[PDB]
Amino acid sequence: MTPAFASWNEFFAMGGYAFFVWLAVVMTVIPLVVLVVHSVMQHRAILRGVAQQRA
Amino acid sequence: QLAIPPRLYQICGWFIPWLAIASVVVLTVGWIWGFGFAPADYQQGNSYRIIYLHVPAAIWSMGIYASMAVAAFIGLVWQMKMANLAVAAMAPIGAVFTFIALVTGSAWGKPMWGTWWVWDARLTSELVLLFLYVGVIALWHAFDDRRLAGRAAGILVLIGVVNLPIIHYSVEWWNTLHQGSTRMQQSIDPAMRSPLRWSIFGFLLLSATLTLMRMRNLILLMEKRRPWVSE
Amino acid sequence: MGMLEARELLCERDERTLFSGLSFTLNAGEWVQITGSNGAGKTTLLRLLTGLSRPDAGEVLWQGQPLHQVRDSYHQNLLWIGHQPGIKTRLTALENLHFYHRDGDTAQCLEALAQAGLAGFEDIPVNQLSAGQQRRVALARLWLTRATLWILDEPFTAIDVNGVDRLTQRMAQHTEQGGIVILTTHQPLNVAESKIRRISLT
Amino acid sequence: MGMLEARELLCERDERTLFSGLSFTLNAGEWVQITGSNGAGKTTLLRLLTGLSRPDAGEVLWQGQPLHQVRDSYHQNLLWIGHQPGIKTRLTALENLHFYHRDGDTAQCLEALAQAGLAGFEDIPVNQLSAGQQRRVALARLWLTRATLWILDEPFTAIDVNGVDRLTQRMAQHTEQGGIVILTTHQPLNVAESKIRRISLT
Amino acid sequence: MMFWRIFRLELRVAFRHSAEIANPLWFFLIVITLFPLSIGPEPQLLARIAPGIIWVAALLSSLLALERLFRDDLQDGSLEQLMLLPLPLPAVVLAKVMAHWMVTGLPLLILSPLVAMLLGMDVYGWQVMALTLLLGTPTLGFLGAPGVALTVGLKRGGVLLSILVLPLTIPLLIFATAAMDAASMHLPVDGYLAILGALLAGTATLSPFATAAALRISIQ
Amino acid sequence: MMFWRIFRLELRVAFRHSAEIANPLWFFLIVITLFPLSIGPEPQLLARIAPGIIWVAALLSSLLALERLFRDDLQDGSLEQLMLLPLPLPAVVLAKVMAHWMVTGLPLLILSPLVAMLLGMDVYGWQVMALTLLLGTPTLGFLGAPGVALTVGLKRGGVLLSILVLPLTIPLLIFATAAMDAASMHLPVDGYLAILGALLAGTATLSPFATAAALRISIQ
């Protein structure tokens, strides 16, 4: 109902240290996405390798 | 009660959806009831917010590694091959958490330090923890024959848990020897701790999701020559 | 009540099942050869039997106890000679056998080395000798030890015909008295087959 | 006039003269085997004719010219397989074949390897494969290459009888088109001795 | 034929299958952090010693990879790469040593921004640092390749103490380690860098023939 | 089959393995002679930098020496201790590593007066690095024993061993460098030695069991 900020990206995403906070959040979100995508793609690749082994 | 067959893949398959669908609903509260609802401090302005992206990446930085000893203790004295693979399962998760913690520390240092890197105990400890993590990763991805890489990783992580408190406790004293003071005081603000608790529980819930999902992968990588995988 | 047995031993190399549920009991004075057709090296079973390697399934029982409970008196009653000679190839032949000899040294080692056929090759570094004579140094340990349970892995590797009869005349007394000898060879035994118990990898 | 004409070859490895004055010429459609014992200059002779090493005296004269002089069109029409397979231990057979294949066809290698015998092993790493299959893959470059000079150093190392038969029958069609082949093996060849030349290592 | 496919061969040996190239990287990070712990977090002192440590670590990793250049190949594949491949033997060597840099130089250039901030050098101390570890690392491989030949017969260590390759590397090190002094005191390297490219030009055209002669005599 | 028999045999075979047992000493010498020219000759600067560089050199020398602890006997003589020699395997590890310190730590200790005279440290400085090397190098051996016991199984590497051992030796480096830094202004140093002795006892109390277990891992 009420935020700690005041307005849109002119008030949000710019608090005087915006670059550091946004660099931190992006460099945290990227490794998690990399981990999950690597794990799921490896999961699919193991079944692919099992299927191709069936020959 | 504990007669684990190669059913874990079927066992931790009913857990992944419910443990991950809830892994975002609690994290979307620890990051939105923060980052826009939590008032900031006075000395750092609107920069006292990286806590949620740094402290949970630091508490579970060692919280995973402390769980490694249990995963290796059961896998050595009781000689359980499956649980030993757990040590090889969540290691990348811990390494990523440590790297995230280091990056967030470097980013948080800039407003006050003026430079990217200064050797601090609360940060060099995470650096050396990353170093033990990458050592474990290199050890496991070295043996061509399985059922041995896990056991070597278990003994190595046991040695690491033995030597970790000594290393850390030498680190804060080495920091005091040269610099001689503390940077930030242990003050968390009463109306700033509940968002931190929510973020801690969210990161814990996501780490469990990653470790179970990787456990599903590791079982197949070592049990790929049996009729069980006929499905 | 007898000595070393087997309890549903099973090992896997992750591609083939070498053996499933192996179980055999050995009492005193029995001559054994591992005769199971090579899927892999028979050395794996022998190592599991000696206790260096932990069985994938089952356990090996010595004198009524497993090999991880009693691990001091069992190694006194043990002698393992594999493909690898197990001798430091920088010292002389006399020095290597001296280490494995408990007492009364320098008065029985050289005689054993001489009867082994390396007479005149005592005070000479091992590395300077032939591979057919290097294995002779390892095989010369047979006449000095007092171990009761011999485990020989491919004993007739590079030994000449003149020594094979002496070997299968000293073990011909060891197994008669109290010995437990386990060979694994592709060449056959000139000794009569009616006495040896052949067991196959099943 | 005429292919490799190594004249008065001489070698003095260690303290023994392996061979002296080996001045033998090779004509077209010539299939020959080197007769010797285990310890003679069997490997040195092949490495000296291939130009990898240089003889103590004499020289090897290809097509009437020294090997080391032209050294450009002799590499493209020569196939030398030594005791070692020559294959990287971590790569699988198929990409090694594309490398060694001079067109990078990715298809002809399939039937070439299938005729070798490893049908269904086109993607398993050679280290994960068996030992004899490694030499089989190494020697599999006989249905792809069109080089009219084959130097076969112990081809029949640990391959089965059927593999020996298929390789020997494949060897037969080479001798008449343009093929000139030299072997160094301890296994007597099953084909008739009438088409075999034999060189004694004197 | 097609030195490109040979180059792809060493890349697939290293990159695709044997994910080992990360190992010397983490070791070089070990070395990078090992010194500040022994000396202290005291910043400006680390701003001067840094080139020496980074270059000794780089040469250590390079000499470690020199063993994998040849000795892992000698037992099984070293004559077929010479017997076959009708293109000149020097050109065969280039690709292999061109993999060496791809194993030892490229990771260092990629991680250089990370190291230049751990020790505490300014940006200008990195722009000049980028164009000395890329202009100097390949050259080290070029002049270290010829002496390998058969210097170590079967043993891993032994004559790698100094033998012959290392004494010729020192006159390279006297340049780079003295170039960054100009970076420490903030003047352009200029001439001290202009000769480094000449060193590359003098080792990318004659060293290959030295390697060819050395291996040809060794196999003889 | 005796403890002292094991030690005597290991010493006797150690001497015949020459041309590589002095290689760590030569590496120590070359790095300690390279560093003064790596950074340049300045009295105060060399005095400040010496305590760290001599210990990183000792660490590298021990790392190089540790590769031959269990590598040589792997294919021939790493066996005959587990199946025989009824003495517990931890005792075997203790014998082997203490003999390794005899052949490696002691020669590192014996040239310390030469190193002190070369780098200018006083008699008090000679005493301080002599004592810290006496109590330090055995800890290096005990800490590297599990690492080598693990890495002999791979039998193709060496940088593995480095990553396994080096991060485990950080507190030793910290305390030793702190002790030497306390010796520059000649303030009394006895407290830093007590902690070094405590960690020596700790690593001599638990590492042999861990190394025995690691050998049991590698053999299978």
Please tell me the distance from the alpha carbon of residue D75 to that of residue D125, in angstroms, as a whole number. 28
The answer to whether residue F20 neighbours chain C at the CB level (below 8 Å) is no
Which of these, F100, F9, F141, F114, lies nearest to F54 by C-alpha position? F114
Number of structural domains (chain B) is 1
Give the one of F30, F39, F159 whose C-beta lies nearest to E27's C-beta: F159
Distance CA F59, CA E107 (A): 25
Domain count, chain E: 1
Return d(Cα F157, Cα F137) in angstroms, integer.
23
E strand or H helix at C65: strand C65-66
The β-bridge relationship of strands C57-59 and C7-12 is: antiparallel
**Which residue from D75, D89, D91 is facing E83, i.e. has the nearest CB?**
D75
Neighboring chains of E (3 or more beta-carbon pairs < 8 A): B, D, F
Whether the Cβ atoms of residue E67 and residue E190 lie closer than 8 Å to each other: no
Quickly list H helices, F67-190. Answer: 89-110, 112-119, 123-151, 159-165, 170-184
Q: Which residues of chain F are within 8 Å of residue C52 when distances are taken between CB atoms?
A: 79, 82-83, 216, 219-220
Q: Which helix (H) or strand (E) is F213 found in, with range? A: helix F191-219
Taking one residue from D and the other from E, the number of pairs with CB-CB distance under 8 angstroms is 53
Closest residue in F to C47 (Cα–Cα): F220
Strands C79-81 and D65-66: unpaired
Per the CB < 8 Å rule, is F163 touching B134? Answer: yes
Residue B129, number of CB atoms within 10 A of its CB:
26
* C-alpha angle F11-F14-F15 in degrees, rounded to nearest 5: 95
Would you tell me which residues 105-124 of chain E have a C-beta closer than 8 angstroms to some C-beta of chain B?
Answer: 117-118, 120
- Asked if B27 has any chain A CB less than 8 Å from its own CB, the reply is no
CB C200 within 8 A of CB C37: yes
How far is the C-alpha of E24 from the C-alpha of E18, rounded, in Å? 13
Q: B35 and B49 in contact (C-beta within 8 Å)?
A: yes
Per-position DSSP letters for E39-63, written without gaps between them: H-S-HHHHHHHHHHHHHHHHHHHHH
Q: Are A29 and B58 in contact (CB under 8 A)?
A: no
Q: Is C2 known as a binding-site position?
A: no
Residue E16 DSSP symbol: I
Q: What is the largest CA-CA distance in chain A?
A: 64
Residue matched to tokens 């290689």 = F23
Residues of chain E in contact with residue F31, where contact means CB-CB under 8 angstroms, are 56
- What is the phi-psi region of residue C117: left when phi exceeds 0, alpha when psi lies from -120 to 50, beta otherwise? left
- Identify whether B3 is part of a domain: no
Q: Are C86 and F75 in contact (CB under 8 A)?
A: no
Q: How far apart are CA F24 and CA F58, in angstroms?
A: 9
Nearest-neighbour CA in chain F from E36: distance (Å): 9
Determine the number of helices (DSSP H) and then strands (DSSP E) in chain D.
Answer: 7, 10
Nearest CA in chain C to F72: C88
C86 appears as a binding residue in the annotation: no
Domain span at residue E197 reads 3-219
Nearest to F166 among E34, E162, E177 (CB): E34
Q: Looking at the complex, does the CB of residue B148 fall below 8 Å from at least one CB of chain F? A: yes
Q: Which of C50, C65, C69 is nearest to C3 (CA)?
A: C65
Is D38 annotated as contributing to ligand binding?
yes
Q: C86 and F79: CB-CB below 8 Å?
A: yes
B2 domain residue, yes or no: no
Within 8 A of B21 by CB-CB distance, chain A residues are none
Torsion, Cα of F181, F184, F186, F189 (10° steps)? 20
D39 is in an annotated binding site: yes
Instruction: Parse chain D into domains and list their residue ranges.
Output: 1-202
Q: Are C45 and C22 in contact (CB under 8 A)?
A: yes
For C192, which DSSP code? -
- Dihedral angle over CA of E185, E186, E191, E194, nearest 10: 120
Length of chain E: 220
The residue length of chain A stands at 55
Cβ contacts (< 8 Å) between C91 and chain F: which residues?
Answer: 12-13, 16
- For residue C35, give Cα distances in angstroms to C38, C42, C156, C184, D63: 9, 9, 15, 7, 56
Amino acid at E173: L
Do chain F and chain A touch with ≥3 beta carbon pairs under 8 Å?
Answer: no
Resolution for this model in angstroms, one decimal place?
4.0
Q: How close does chain D come to E85, measured CA to CA in Å?
A: 7
**Residue B58 lies inside a defined structural domain of this protein:** yes
Which stretches within chain C are classed as H helix?
43-50, 73-76, 93-99, 109-115, 131-139, 161-177
Beta strands in chain D (DSSP E): 7-11, 19-22, 31-35, 57-59, 61-62, 65-66, 79-81, 150-153, 181-184, 197-200
Q: Does C87 contact F77 at a Cβ distance shorter than 8 Å?
A: yes
CA-CA distance, D95 to D80, in Å (whole number)? 19
Best mutation target, F53, F61, F159, to test chain E (most E CBs within 10 A): F159
Please check whether residue B174 touches E, CB under 8 A: yes
The b-or-e profile of F169-206 (16+ CB within 10 A means b, else e) is bbbbbbbbbbbbbbbbeeeebeebbebbeebbeebbeb
Residue found under tokens 């024959």: B145
Distance between CA atoms of residues D23 and C116, nearest Å: 47
Report the residue from B117, B127, B138 with minimal CB separation from E117: B117
Backbone φ and ψ for C111, nearest 5 degrees, come out as -65, -40
Rounded CA-CA distance D181/D167 in Å is 13
Nearest CA among B56, B172, B55, B44 for reference residue B110: B44
Interchain pair A15, B206: CB under 8 A = no
Report the DSSP pairing between strands C65-66 and C61-62.
antiparallel
Residue B160 and residue F217: Cβ atoms within 8 Å? no
| Domain residue extents for chain A | 18-55
Measure the CA–CA gap between C162 and C179, rounded to whole angstroms.
23
Nearest to C190 by CA among B101, C171, C202: C171
